[PDB]
Amino acid sequence: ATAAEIAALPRQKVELVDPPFVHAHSQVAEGGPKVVEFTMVIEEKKIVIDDAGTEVHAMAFNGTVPGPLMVVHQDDYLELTLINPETNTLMHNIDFHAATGALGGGGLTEINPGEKTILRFKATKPGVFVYHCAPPGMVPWHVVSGMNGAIMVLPREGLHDGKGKALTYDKIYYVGEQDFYVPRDENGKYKKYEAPGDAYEDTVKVMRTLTPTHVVFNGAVGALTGDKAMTAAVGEKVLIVHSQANRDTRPHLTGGHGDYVWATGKFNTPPDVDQETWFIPGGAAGAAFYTFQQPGIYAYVNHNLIEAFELGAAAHFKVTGEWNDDLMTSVLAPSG
Amino acid sequence: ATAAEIAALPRQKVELVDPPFVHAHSQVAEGGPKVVEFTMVIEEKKIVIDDAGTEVHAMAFNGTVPGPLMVVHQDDYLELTLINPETNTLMHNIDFHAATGALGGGGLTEINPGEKTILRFKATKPGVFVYHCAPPGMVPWHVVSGMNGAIMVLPREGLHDGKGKALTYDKIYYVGEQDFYVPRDENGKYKKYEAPGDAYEDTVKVMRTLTPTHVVFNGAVGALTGDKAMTAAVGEKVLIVHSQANRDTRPHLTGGHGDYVWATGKFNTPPDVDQETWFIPGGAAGAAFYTFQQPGIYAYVNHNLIEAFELGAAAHFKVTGEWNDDLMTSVLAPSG
Amino acid sequence: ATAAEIAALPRQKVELVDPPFVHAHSQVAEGGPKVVEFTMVIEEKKIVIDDAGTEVHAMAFNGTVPGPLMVVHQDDYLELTLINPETNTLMHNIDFHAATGALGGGGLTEINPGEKTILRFKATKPGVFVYHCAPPGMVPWHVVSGMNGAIMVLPREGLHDGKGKALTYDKIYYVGEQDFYVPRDENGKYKKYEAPGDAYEDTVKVMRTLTPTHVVFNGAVGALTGDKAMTAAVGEKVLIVHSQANRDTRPHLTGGHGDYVWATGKFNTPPDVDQETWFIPGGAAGAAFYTFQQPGIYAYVNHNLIEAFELGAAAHFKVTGEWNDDLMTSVLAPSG
Numbered sequence A, B, C: 001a002t003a004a005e006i007a008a009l010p011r012q013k014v015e016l017v018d019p020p021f022v023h024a025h026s027q028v029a030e031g032g033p034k035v036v037e038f039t040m041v042i043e044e045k046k047i048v049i050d051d052a053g054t055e056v057h058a059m060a061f062n063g064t065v066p067g068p069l070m071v072v073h074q075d076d077y078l079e080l081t082l083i084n085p086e087t088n089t090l091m092h093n094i095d096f097h098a099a100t101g102a103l104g105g106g107g108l109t110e111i112n113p114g115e116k117t118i119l120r121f122k123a124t125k126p127g128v129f130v131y132h133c134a135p136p137g138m139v140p141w142h143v144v145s146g147m148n149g150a151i152m153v154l155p156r157e158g159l160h161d162g163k164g165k166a167l168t169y170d171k172i173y174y175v176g177e178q179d180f181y182v183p184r185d186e187n188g189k190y191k192k193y194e195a196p197g198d199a200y201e202d203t204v205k206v207m208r209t210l211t212p213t214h215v216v217f218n219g220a221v222g223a224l225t226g227d228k229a230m231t232a233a234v235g236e237k238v239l240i241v242h243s244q245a246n247r248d249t250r251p252h253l254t255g256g257h258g259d260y261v262w263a264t265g266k267f268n269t270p271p272d273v274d275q276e277t278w279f280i281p282g283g284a285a286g287a288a289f290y291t292f293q294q295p296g297i298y299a300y301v302n303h304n305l306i307e308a309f310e311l312g313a314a315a316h317f318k319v320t321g322e323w324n325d326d327l328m329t330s331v332l333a334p335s336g
């Protein structure tokens, strides 16, 4: 496409929503290629990641950890206006794994506090992809401070299984998983810092142990539980997009399965089926499609159970509906 | 199927055998759907896991680590009678990744010492699946204390390759891999405790380092070596089921390959082929099919070689038969 | 084939080249099966792996870490003459994951300093496979001292995508990833030794932490960056072979993708497509095919960014050519 052809394409401004929710979209593309516009303001902010009150100086796209999920269709152009407010103290940029060229856009979006930039790229490949900040010389520090999210490039014909059958979800959730490396004092208590830079040296030492102190979903231990638990109903089809920009994860839906899982997150790669626990390598996004068949509470975890239950990588689903005794039944309840 | 139809299905009791061996079964289903009955008694007991007398208070399904492999066919029902003797001290339950609903059966099988329960679930998805204990609030502790195993849900038509050609094995082995986190005193000596609970705090601390003190097959260093090596003969087809309920592993048959490997453990997902080293994520089981071509000793390991040779994740196969010089030959033996 | 028949096959002597380059070869087999000859001298030597002058007592095949890539075609025979100089201090051998029998050849190639051996095996399976030293009792120590490499067994008809379309690369690079475990003194300073054996005890202690002190490409931090960056031009098809003999890795081409990725490293297993970040388990090799579309610098990393940017797992590609504004463009460059 020439500049003239691209300038002639229709444009659509999209309002982002906070994870785990996803902004309104159409699974099957409506019309021809478009330039989909998004705007995100970067916020360096203090966030609490656990019930004890542990703090992290987060570097957050759109003010959240993970950054929001942007949705477009194959061959659409994603045009992101990225803003680094003067209240911030560090330079930031953005690397879209979905993009081609200049370190994913990273080489063209380096903005200092008080600057903004507009990057446009063609979403040539379908799938879910990670996006993350990556300032030369300070790459992992920004990523493990929460500066990452994901986008979904849907095929123009919507999702299909490995054999051509269409797969239409009723709802979609985006679960961003984050590994945090929080310094501790001699009492084993987590430390607090006045400014983000003050935490750098202590944090890098923890990062080098390759052992996170917290592994969480949606930015905090228990963030997707209670009134914030995800929801579904028996018979409902749910797509769960999951990303980890720096470290491996192994998603599992307790009491369920991944009926179709694009473990690599790429739609042209046939999905695995009937999965118990799938694997998403650090630096990637994956997606699982499931039709709930049983009501009740489900846990959704990173299946290194220590990471799930001790470090924080566990969410819940509340599912409404009728119990199916054919699928499962207590023949004899716990008794003497 | 209707209520009467399920109640009318034949019921069959099966005697279990301890890993790495597998109970009597047919690869191709015999007759229509059946309710296959198994019984397992939970045993809390101290076991020695290395050559230094290191102890672990194991929580063992059927008295073994891993728990035994249960085999059924797709759409059969698995009806487990689970017993928790009054001599035990903790509440236990069971979560079948192969099942649908109630946290895999966990929400319906919580039994205190002195209680038993009977759970039935329809094995709707074909493949090998992990099962493990999962008491709310203490999930990883029970799992990393050895309370996990696996089941195999064979397709009613038996196994097939990607082209639909039948794959029939001569023998099957089940290798359960267990990551242990044993506390040490300040002098580096592994600690011993009177009761399981006494070790809880110390153990969780080691678990949080995400660094196991031991990684073993069949419950101990060297359990599947020497006089306990698994066996085969040239020309024999062997299925090796491998599980890891809490942590990633990467199986490798030294001197062989995985001709067909259902790396995700699910039979409707086409098997990878000609594999050197496959990957099984924590929280899942995988299965490899190999036809032996050379006699001699083989090592079967988790290919992070430190885990295999320093931590304990190494087994052996002793294979009989004639050597094939076409496949391999020493043209010039070691000489000065 | 009989001994006589093999004896009558044509023989071709190959001259090996140091990584990341690969020796001359033809993608499509030239003629019928042949006995491809390779010779490698083992060199125990000191290598400096970081800018702090940190030393490792390398055990290097052909004098490099990783050892060089050997290329043959399916059903050719690979005949390796392995030499252990009298100047070396340890026994060494070689295990080809591509081979069948005698522990991959390890049991037939144990050579003391001053000895040599000749091993021949039939390359029956197509793909990239790891090869590494494995002396009984000291297996991981030699592997994490850099004694590993890989070989590529090309289909006789060259590479093809999942549907049969031929995939022909213009260039090929071999990236060997190495996890190193360097002991430190009380002040956190890396220790130096005057003999491989002297560091054994101290190194095993670090190895047991399963936490490498360094993770590098081609033997050292920066080995494949700056001036030693790999090169290509817009429009060129490049195959990147990557191996890790002991620990998992997750390759990512920053600003690009893996158009076709044989993540398991095996050619009869259809490749995944449109990959952002792929996964290679320790003990295996993988291969990605990509056609460059944008010029500029590309980072190629292990996407656990701490491993890439703190521990050393990062390489560069320098690509020439014209920028494509359709694929990506800076609508508004960084500005106030």
Ligand SMILES: O=N[O-]
Residues within 6 Å of the ligand: A252, A253, A254, A299, A301, B095, B134
């Ligand atoms: O899904 N927790 O075992």
Ligand SMILES: O=N[O-]
Residues within 6 Å of the ligand: B252, B253, B254, B299, B301, B303, B305, C095, C134
């Ligand atoms: O399978 N040992 O490298």
Ligand SMILES: O=N[O-]
Residues within 6 Å of the ligand: A095, A134, C252, C253, C254, C255, C299, C301, C303
């Ligand atoms: O691919 N570097 O984030």
Ligand SMILES: [Cu+2]
Residues within 6 Å of the ligand: A059, A091, A092, A093, A133, A134, A135, A142, A147
């Ligand atoms: Cu940033």
Ligand SMILES: [Cu+2]
Residues within 6 Å of the ligand: A095, A097, A132, A283, C252, C254, C303
């Ligand atoms: Cu990246």
Ligand SMILES: [Cu+2]
Residues within 6 Å of the ligand: B059, B091, B092, B093, B133, B134, B135, B142, B147
């Ligand atoms: Cu239990």
Ligand SMILES: [Cu+2]
Residues within 6 Å of the ligand: A252, A254, B095, B097, B132, B283
């Ligand atoms: Cu589970």
Ligand SMILES: [Cu+2]
Residues within 6 Å of the ligand: C059, C091, C092, C093, C133, C134, C135, C142, C147
């Ligand atoms: Cu060696």
Ligand SMILES: [Cu+2]
Residues within 6 Å of the ligand: B252, B254, C095, C097, C132, C283
């Ligand atoms: Cu090996």
